[PDB]
Enzyme design. Structure first.
Site, PDB file in Angstrom:
ATOM      1  N   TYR A 509       0.953  -1.100   0.000  1.00 56.65           N
ATOM      2  CA  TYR A 509       0.000   0.000   0.000  1.00 56.65           C
ATOM      3  C   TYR A 509       1.008   1.164   0.000  1.00 56.65           C
ATOM      4  O   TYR A 509       1.236   1.788  -1.016  1.00 56.65           O
ATOM      5  CB  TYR A 509      -0.877   0.003   1.263  1.00 56.65           C
ATOM      6  N   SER A 592      -4.551   0.395  -5.961  1.00 60.57           N
ATOM      7  CA  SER A 592      -4.623   1.817  -5.676  1.00 60.57           C
ATOM      8  C   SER A 592      -3.251   2.454  -5.496  1.00 60.57           C
ATOM      9  O   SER A 592      -2.434   2.400  -6.402  1.00 60.57           O
ATOM     10  CB  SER A 592      -5.460   2.023  -4.418  1.00 60.57           C
ATOM     11  N   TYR A 593      -2.999   3.064  -4.338  1.00 65.09           N
ATOM     12  CA  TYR A 593      -1.688   3.686  -4.110  1.00 65.09           C
ATOM     13  C   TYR A 593      -0.676   2.549  -4.198  1.00 65.09           C
ATOM     14  O   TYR A 593       0.426   2.715  -4.737  1.00 65.09           O
ATOM     15  CB  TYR A 593      -1.615   4.373  -2.739  1.00 65.09           C
ATOM     16  N   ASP A 670     -14.240   2.711 -13.223  1.00 63.79           N
ATOM     17  CA  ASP A 670     -13.656   3.181 -11.959  1.00 63.79           C
ATOM     18  C   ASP A 670     -13.898   4.677 -11.911  1.00 63.79           C
ATOM     19  O   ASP A 670     -13.331   5.429 -12.723  1.00 63.79           O
ATOM     20  CB  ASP A 670     -12.139   2.897 -11.919  1.00 63.79           C
ATOM     21  N   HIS A 702     -13.815   0.837  -8.735  1.00 58.92           N
ATOM     22  CA  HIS A 702     -12.538   0.769  -8.024  1.00 58.92           C
ATOM     23  C   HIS A 702     -12.282  -0.477  -7.180  1.00 58.92           C
ATOM     24  O   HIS A 702     -11.144  -0.823  -6.918  1.00 58.92           O
ATOM     25  CB  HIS A 702     -12.323   2.040  -7.172  1.00 58.92           C
TER      26      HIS A 702
HETATM   27  C1  LIG Z   1      -4.474   0.462  -0.641  1.00 62.18           C
HETATM   28  N1  LIG Z   1      -5.335   1.548  -0.151  1.00 62.18           N
HETATM   29  C2  LIG Z   1      -5.135   2.800  -0.665  1.00 62.18           C
HETATM   30  O1  LIG Z   1      -4.301   3.059  -1.499  1.00 62.18           O
HETATM   31  C3  LIG Z   1      -5.997   3.879  -0.162  1.00 62.18           C
HETATM   32  C4  LIG Z   1      -6.912   3.538   0.749  1.00 62.18           C
HETATM   33  N2  LIG Z   1      -7.590   4.779   1.024  1.00 62.18           N
HETATM   34  C5  LIG Z   1      -7.065   5.709   0.305  1.00 62.18           C
HETATM   35  N3  LIG Z   1      -7.428   7.049   0.263  1.00 62.18           N
HETATM   36  C6  LIG Z   1      -8.279   7.471   1.429  1.00 62.18           C
HETATM   37  C7  LIG Z   1      -9.772   7.216   1.135  1.00 62.18           C
HETATM   38  N4  LIG Z   1     -10.237   7.982  -0.057  1.00 62.18           N
HETATM   39  C8  LIG Z   1      -9.196   8.351  -1.056  1.00 62.18           C
HETATM   40  C9  LIG Z   1      -8.041   7.365  -1.095  1.00 62.18           C
HETATM   41  N5  LIG Z   1      -6.075   5.183  -0.420  1.00 62.18           N
HETATM   42  C10 LIG Z   1      -5.080   5.951  -1.195  1.00 62.18           C
HETATM   43  C11 LIG Z   1      -5.310   6.065  -2.691  1.00 62.18           C
HETATM   44  C12 LIG Z   1      -6.346   5.304  -3.331  1.00 62.18           C
HETATM   45  C13 LIG Z   1      -6.542   5.425  -4.721  1.00 62.18           C
HETATM   46  C14 LIG Z   1      -5.714   6.294  -5.472  1.00 62.18           C
HETATM   47  C15 LIG Z   1      -4.688   7.044  -4.831  1.00 62.18           C
HETATM   48  C16 LIG Z   1      -4.491   6.926  -3.439  1.00 62.18           C
HETATM   49  N6  LIG Z   1      -7.098   2.276   1.256  1.00 62.18           N
HETATM   50  C17 LIG Z   1      -8.143   2.031   2.265  1.00 62.18           C
HETATM   51  C18 LIG Z   1      -6.283   1.251   0.792  1.00 62.18           C
HETATM   52  O2  LIG Z   1      -6.406   0.099   1.211  1.00 62.18           O
END
Ligand SMILES: Cn1c(=O)c2c(nc(N3CC[NH2+]CC3)n2Cc2ccccc2)n(C)c1=O
Ligand SMILES: *[C@@H]1O[C@H](CO)[C@@H](O[C@@H]2O[C@H](CO)[C@@H](O[C@@H]3O[C@H](CO)[C@@H](O)[C@H](O)[C@@H]3O)[C@H](O)[C@H]2NC(C)=O)[C@H](O)[C@H]1NC(C)=O
Ligand SMILES: *[C@@H]1O[C@H](CO)[C@@H](O[C@@H]2O[C@H](CO)[C@@H](O)[C@H](O)[C@H]2NC(C)=O)[C@H](O)[C@H]1NC(C)=O
Ligand SMILES: *[C@@H]1O[C@H](CO)[C@@H](O[C@@H]2O[C@H](CO)[C@@H](O)[C@H](O)[C@H]2NC(C)=O)[C@H](O)[C@H]1NC(C)=O
Ligand SMILES: *[C@@H]1O[C@H](CO)[C@@H](O[C@@H]2O[C@H](CO)[C@@H](O)[C@H](O)[C@H]2NC(C)=O)[C@H](O)[C@H]1NC(C)=O
Ligand SMILES: Cn1c(=O)c2c(nc(N3CC[NH2+]CC3)n2Cc2ccccc2)n(C)c1=O
Ligand SMILES: Cn1c(=O)c2c(nc(N3CC[NH2+]CC3)n2Cc2ccccc2)n(C)c1=O
Ligand SMILES: Cn1c(=O)c2c(nc(N3CC[NH2+]CC3)n2Cc2ccccc2)n(C)c1=O
Ligand SMILES: *[C@@H]1O[C@H](CO)[C@@H](O)[C@H](O)[C@H]1NC(C)=O
Ligand SMILES: *[C@@H]1O[C@H](CO)[C@@H](O)[C@H](O)[C@H]1NC(C)=O
Ligand SMILES: *[C@@H]1O[C@H](CO)[C@@H](O)[C@H](O)[C@H]1NC(C)=O
Ligand SMILES: *[C@@H]1O[C@H](CO)[C@@H](O)[C@H](O)[C@H]1NC(C)=O
Ligand SMILES: *[C@@H]1O[C@H](CO)[C@@H](O)[C@H](O)[C@H]1NC(C)=O
Ligand SMILES: *[C@@H]1O[C@H](CO)[C@@H](O)[C@H](O)[C@H]1NC(C)=O
Ligand SMILES: *[C@@H]1O[C@H](CO)[C@@H](O)[C@H](O)[C@H]1NC(C)=O
Ligand SMILES: *[C@@H]1O[C@H](CO)[C@@H](O)[C@H](O)[C@H]1NC(C)=O
Lengths: 728, 728
Positions: A509, A592-593, A670, A702
């Site tokens: 992550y 995601s990240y 997404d 997503h």
């Molecule tokens: C792995 N991963 C993530 O990465 C993640 C996340 N929650 C977030 N953010 C907070 C909630 N709303 C916006 C995103 N991101 C970061 C992220 C997600 C998508 C694109 C860029 C950054 N969770 C809960 C997660 O498990």
């Protein structure tokens, strides 16, 4: 020899993990769904009586998605026709049932496609949003009074959040808050008039001849954001032939001056409300406690009742500033803020004084404040054993910060090191929820003497089931990077052979304030990979991770894609030296990240990873939303942080993918990380003459979470890894 | 040792096949571009002179994409700023250059973003389309005269075709026709007002923060179609302050009665025009020869001058009804139509009588009529040696049809079996174009003596380069399926050992009137597969294929996805029995209709194919355009052909994909076969629990032809095939 935890075991959830969801409704009673009916438990003795027979659900002509009992217990809402929108938002149909008459209200029904609905904190009033406007029903059977007139599809939202506020600010769709006694109904209005639209195709069922184009006002980094208005409505005068009495509260001048966000609302007393605002920059927030002036209906703010909170090293709070927890009388409040040393701790504030006093301290952090009485403050922290991936409940004496006791620390030390709690109305009782490292355990306790009272759910069934399966073991440890101790976790295959060189999968992550290393028990894809495929799966929390102080968390401020990506590589290098790891078969994956970091790692040219999988990854920050992105990166202008936006794209590392085997996956619908991000990354890779694999998931969003898509992606990823690791 | 023909050789065109493109401009002269100079050749005596020195191009100041010399040779048009749209359409900027005063016209310049432009057939008048309206310039230096005022983006098209007419009817963007002497300018107007829009995302360059949405009026099967109007403008009255003199010619009542298409226009004399129309059903078309009435300016239609063509077993023509070739006087014409035996032959019609007389006959077909003089008709047919995949030029004496000569059959029987020809004005000379089976050969001939005169290009250089490489051989032969002989071809690896067992790739098109088996020489992906990877690549033309009579071609009328798919399977089954085929390693692939057949085959559950690759396939007929789809399938209504539309989808066969390895490829900006088709197909495969592979290509269209995408798709398909065949 037994069997192993298989992919099908994971996909079909063959091994059920039980939980115990209850809803407190008084200082000593709670509602619980058992065998389809709503029971009423008396925490004190443990005796239960029926509150709603399953029979009543059957007599309704639909599937009941959710129920909500009114505070006075005279009515209950039945939610059905559930239609998901984004992560928290959705529309539904609602029926109001009369628990006295044990009948179903039929006159003046809640409208179809209702966006949000909620009972008042007392009695049984109702406020709901429909077509972006707010409505109030003082009595279930009476007609509703319209509160707002500005609602406009995709443009003006009253009582509910727009896309970015739902996902990045409130983590909720709702933007309505009743006063403690129901006099006032506060709400926010969001204006997306100038917010650009993200557009993408939605194919829908095979029968649709022409695809649909979805349009959502979505502010990407640096773009125009939605604007906001906060109002407090006096519901006492709502009358069919009367206007609406409402007052607009604006943020203090130090924030009103430029773009801002409303990030929190807390009712203190019927005549006192706390608003929390933050500048667009997000390193400056302010709490404004406003008092109602009975003679004019105004809500007044004063400089003495205002409290600033800034950050020089990063952003405020974890994903938003922490919320204030006020005393019963509202003259003071407790809130978590960063230390002189950078650690999040509970500070005591006087409502009308600026200086605050910390009541907790240490090289660890308070996660959140769970409850407050005149005498005590209950909170969750990762203090115990100094492990940041652990969580426990603590109670501190308000008239003596020396008296702090840990209510969960020693209950079951080997099985339970990660808890959350839920207190009854005046904190007379609390349910403790243990999520690991052992099987989840739910128990009830009395605040009087902290007696165990009784077990609510111990997962004994799952335990019996698992003893016949070759489960992998999970181990947590620390490694030192640049003089700092950082935590990692490894899921190790059963009957581990130290003489064998196991392939290694890094699960990542690594986003700001992320925590992939913890003592939570999970039956996951990695469980399967380790149990059946003999793949070691590990995660690491380096620079940028949370719950270990701002020095660590803020390390990636204004430079996303640098130190956190680099630490994943260096940590893996260290793991690759362990004798039981096959340094020639190391893979990395994330969503995601985590997909962004996975991609940046593979594009680093470190020669450390053989292959990797990125699922719904950010590929360029200017494509992600304004609220989240700017919080860490500032604005993409040459006057601010443009240089770091430009050299942190995955596309800039395209040439280096010629060295690895890459799988890029993305849902076409997404609405969060737009398919566009992967579309742009695949194009740069193709332009670079780099071969790789992709997989789109039609109409999936997503979470790529529909039943079949979920099975399909994990099955597809498992085949790719097995091929990468030469596993039959 | 020797090099084999590699993937890079194919991808980078290392071995260049040369050609000889010329433009006839009189009965004995042609223009030719050499060393960037425009040369003027004299066919009589073979001498040549410089028409335009390349110095001129260097002085221009932009890359000249193309040029067009005025018929009177006084001016030349220079095309630059070329921007492609669909298959034939594009826009450009144009300069007019005065050849006499060797200067560039700079007054009243042709506008930028011009959609189409053409000199009149004599003189130097120009007609062009800009912003969907037509303009005429009598002189390069004079202001143009607007002809239409209805032009409207995405709605009304004057002088150019809308999307479906461009792609399926005219196979051209142009929709205007000058009369032989430049008196009249005929043009069609298309109205897309009620045509639904296909919408999809275009991501563009990485810097574009938000994707754009492309919208094209595109009629899918059974949807509302564009309507058309046809006009003839008398250009003699064009004057700055005069109105436009024009006359609308409407189709005959038998077609006017319902939805129809204008499918062809042919000027006969300055006062006689032939319009060819077809019903939306497309098994009924009519030719309407209209005469100009000098006293009223109208174009008159008469029943005696109307000729009907229908089909009782399928549709009319191959992809459209064949065009009429009129005599100089316009009193009769020659046109290819199906005879009583179901074979397409040349019929001679009297312009004002309904019966015609066939001048060719036999179990073979005339491909096209190339040229016509008072005494001879020249045509191309596949009569020679009875091989449908061969092509030769024949001349038939008009006053004695039993007298026919084959002009190309014996020039080079071993090297040349597939010809095309281009005749000078009045058919005095002709260039012959040989495409195989040997290396392409271009020659010039005299029609009076039929002497060869000279070799324009013989590719002796390529022949030399190839002597050093291990090239595969191509073999054509026959097999019997259900009592009918069908043709097939195999590209065989070098040193083909009849005793060894080679993997087999089936390359399929198999659409209605397709011909994948021919004697054309091609340096293709398949060449590399045979030469370097030792894979046999075969193609087969079964039921539904063309050039072998209607019995074979119409076999799939109203049932696409049935017999042509089954024939690919049975032919391969026979191939797998030949002895030199490794039946454990047989694959199939195709683009477009071939991608559709490839998928239907894999979904057949025949157990014959191990794997397959489908590129931009149709997955469901209701998703493809109206003109093409309906031609063969009728309407997707329960009254008409819905049952066959419904059970001919690839999705209905999803369950059988569990037995095969499949790779699905599609460009996201495909405006022809929408990405939606593969997106709905993958969704059905996911829903059925089928694992398979995917590959989207960002911003690529139906050809996936950008330089980098082209290299990427073939490199990716090679890897997939090689992995399927266990080839290192
Ligand atoms: C792995 N991963 C993530 O990465 C993640 C996340 N929650 C977030 N953010 C907070 C909630 N709303 C916006 C995103 N991101 C970061 C992220 C997600 C998508 C694109 C860029 C950054 N969770 C809960 C997660 O498990
Ligand atoms: C403008 O026109 C002149 C001709 O008037 C061009 O010069 C010609 O250029 C060609 C191409 O380079 C030369 O041909 C070469 O000949 C040798 C054969 O010995 C062959 O090995 C090469 O493959 C090629 O065919 C040609 O000799 C030369 N002719 C003259 C008269 O110099 C000139 O290139 C043109 N300008 C540009 C930049 O296009
Ligand atoms: C939403 O915000 C927009 C600004 O983007 C407001 O629009 C302006 O409204 C004023 C008064 O009607 C006009 O003079 C401006 O021309 C408008 N600007 C634009 C960009 O349209 C709009 O009024 C706001 N709506 C609400 C309910 O507050
Ligand atoms: C973007 O550029 C910056 C500045 O050049 C990079 O930061 C440097 O990173 C190297 C590691 O390779 C360090 O040794 C330097 O000390 C860093 N300099 C600074 C100013 O901190 C940064 O890594 C680049 N970002 C990405 C994602 O590649
Ligand atoms: C759609 O259904 C028709 C009707 O069943 C299929 O045609 C039949 O196919 C079988 C098996 O190949 C033949 O034996 C029958 O004679 C056919 N019946 C008729 C009336 O044609 C057709 O193949 C199906 N289409 C597809 C693509 O599966
Ligand atoms: C606060 N407030 C209101 O109350 C209000 C209102 N618009 C209305 N109505 C819209 C159409 N019907 C009549 C007016 N009212 C209700 C109202 C106004 C004045 C007297 C009585 C009722 N707006 C736009 C508003 O902002
Ligand atoms: C055939 N025809 C025309 O010729 C024509 C026309 N619209 C115009 N003009 C548009 C603006 N300027 C004046 C009218 N003209 C040209 C014209 C008409 C009458 C006398 C002289 C010139 N339309 C719509 C048309 O269909
Ligand atoms: C392989 N393949 C095809 O399949 C094909 C084709 N040409 C056509 N049609 C006629 C011209 N323009 C419209 C299509 N199709 C058939 C087809 C294409 C796409 C979807 C459905 C059918 N060509 C030249 C080809 O080489
Ligand atoms: C309702 O509750 C009874 C026990 O009180 C239980 O036996 C029954 O299964 C429930 N009805 C259902 C199946 O919803
Ligand atoms: C539990 O039992 C007590 C009697 O000791 C009774 O007063 C109380 O109402 C009961 N509560 C419930 C909900 O069963
Ligand atoms: C409100 O106005 C309506 C007008 O139709 C009227 O019928 C109603 O009595 C009014 N309410 C009162 C009693 O003031
Ligand atoms: C807050 O962030 C902005 C970046 O937009 C920065 O310019 C400003 O100096 C920061 N303030 C603090 C307290 O660091
Ligand atoms: C070829 O030669 C003839 C006479 O021999 C001459 O009239 C003609 O113009 C020449 N053609 C060219 C283009 O050189
Ligand atoms: C185009 O067609 C529509 C009907 O679909 C009609 O209303 C309109 O006037 C037509 N436009 C022209 C210029 O023919
Ligand atoms: C056309 O009319 C304009 C004025 O409207 C005039 O300037 C011009 O001279 C006229 N042209 C002709 C050909 O008469
Ligand atoms: C042409 O097609 C129509 C509609 O599909 C059909 O009813 C008619 O019989 C066909 N015409 C002929 C002559 O076969």
């Amino acid at each position: 020899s037994r069997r192993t935890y298989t992919l099908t075991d994971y996909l079909k959830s063959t091994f059920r993990v039980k939980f115990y969801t209850l809803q407190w409704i008084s200082d000593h009673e709670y509602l619980y769904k058992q065998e389809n009916n709503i029971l009423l438990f008396n925490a004190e003795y443990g005796n239960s009586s029926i509150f709603l027979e399953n029979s009543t659900f059957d007599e309704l002509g639909y599937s009941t998605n959710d129920y909500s009992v009114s505070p006075d217990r005279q009515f209950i809402l039945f939610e059905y026709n559930y239609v998901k929108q984004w992560r928290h938002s959705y529309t539904a149909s609602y029926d109001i049932y009369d628990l006295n008459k044990r009948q179903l209200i039929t006159e003046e029904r809640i409208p179809n496609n209702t966006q949000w609905i909620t009972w008042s904190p007392v009695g049984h009033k109702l406020a709901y949003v429909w077509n972006n406007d707010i409505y109030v029903k003082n009595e279930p059977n009476l007609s509703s009074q319209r509160i707002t007139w500005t609602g406009k599809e995709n443009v003006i939202y009253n009582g509910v959040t727009d896309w970015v506020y739902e996902e990045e600010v409130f983590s909720a769709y709702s933007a309505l808050w009743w006063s403690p006694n129901g006099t006032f109904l506060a709400y926010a209005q969001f204006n997306d008039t100038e917010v650009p639209l993200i557009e993408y195709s939605f194919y829908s069922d095979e029968s649709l001849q022409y695809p649909k184009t979805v349009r959502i006002p979505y502010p990407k980094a640096g773009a125009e954001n939605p604007t906001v208005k906060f109002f407090v409505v006096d519901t006492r005068t709502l009358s069919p032939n009367a206007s609406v009495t409402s007052y607009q509260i604006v943020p203090p001048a130090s924030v009103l001056i430029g773009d801002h966000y409303l990030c929190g609302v807390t009712w203190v007393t019927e005549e006192r409300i706390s608003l929390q605002w933050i500048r667009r920059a997000q390193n400056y927030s302010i709490i404004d406690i406003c008092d109602y002036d009975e003679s004019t209906g105004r809500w007044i703010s004063s400089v003495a009742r205002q409290h600033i909170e800034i950050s020089t090293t990063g952003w405020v709070g974890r994903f938003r500033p922490a919320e204030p927890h006020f005393t019963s009388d509202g003259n003071s409040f407790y809130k978590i803020i960063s230390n002189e040393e950078g650690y999040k701790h509970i500070c005591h504030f006087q409502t009308d004084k600026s200086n605050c006093t910390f009541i907790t301290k240490g090289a660890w952090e308070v996660i959140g404040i769970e409850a407050l009485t005149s005498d005590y403050l209950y909170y969750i922290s990762n203090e115990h054993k100094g492990m940041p991936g652990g969580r426990n409940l603590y109670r501190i004496q308000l008239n003596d910060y020396t008296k702090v006791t840990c209510l969960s620390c020693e209950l079951n030390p080997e099985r339970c090191q990660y808890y959350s709690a839920s207190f009854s109305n005046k904190a007379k009782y609390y349910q403790l929820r243990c999520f690991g490292p052992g099987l989840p355990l739910y128990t009830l306790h009395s605040s009087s003497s902290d007696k165990e009272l009784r077990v609510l759910e111990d997962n004994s069934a799952l335990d019996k089931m698992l003893q016949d399966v070759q489960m992998p073991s999970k181990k947590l440890d620390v490694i030192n990077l640049h003089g700092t101790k950082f935590w990692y976790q490894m899921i190790l295959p059963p009957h581990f052979d130290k003489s064998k060189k196991y392939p290694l999968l890094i699960e990542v992550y690594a986003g700001p304030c992320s925590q992939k290393v913890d003592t939570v028990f999970r039956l996951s894809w990695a469980t399967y990979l380790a149990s059946t495929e003999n793949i070691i799966v590990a995660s690491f929390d380096g620079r940028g991770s949370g719950y270990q102080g701002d020095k660590i968390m803020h390390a990636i401020n204004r430079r996303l894609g640098t130190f956190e990506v680099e630490d994943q590589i260096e940590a893996t290098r260290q793991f690759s030296k362990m004798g039981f790891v096959d340094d020639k078969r190391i893979a990395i994956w994330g969503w995601s990240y985590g997909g962004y970091v996975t991609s940046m790692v593979l594009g680093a040219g470190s020669g450390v990873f053989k292959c990797g999988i990125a699922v719904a990854p950010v590929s360029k920050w200017e494509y992600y939303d304004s609220v989240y992105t700017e919080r860490y990166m500032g604005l993409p202008t040459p006057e601010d942080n443009l240089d770091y936006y430009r050299n942190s794209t995955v596309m800039s590392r395209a040439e280096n993918f010629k060295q690895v085997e890459y799988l890029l996956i993305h849902g076409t619908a997404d609405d969060n990380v737009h398919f566009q991000q992967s579309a742009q990354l695949s194009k740069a890779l193709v332009d670079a003459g780099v071969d790789f694999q992709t997989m789109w998931y039609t109409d999936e969003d997503h979470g790529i979470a529909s039943n079949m898509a979920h099975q399909h992606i994990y099955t597809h990823m498992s085949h790719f890894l097995k091929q990468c690791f030469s596993l039959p």
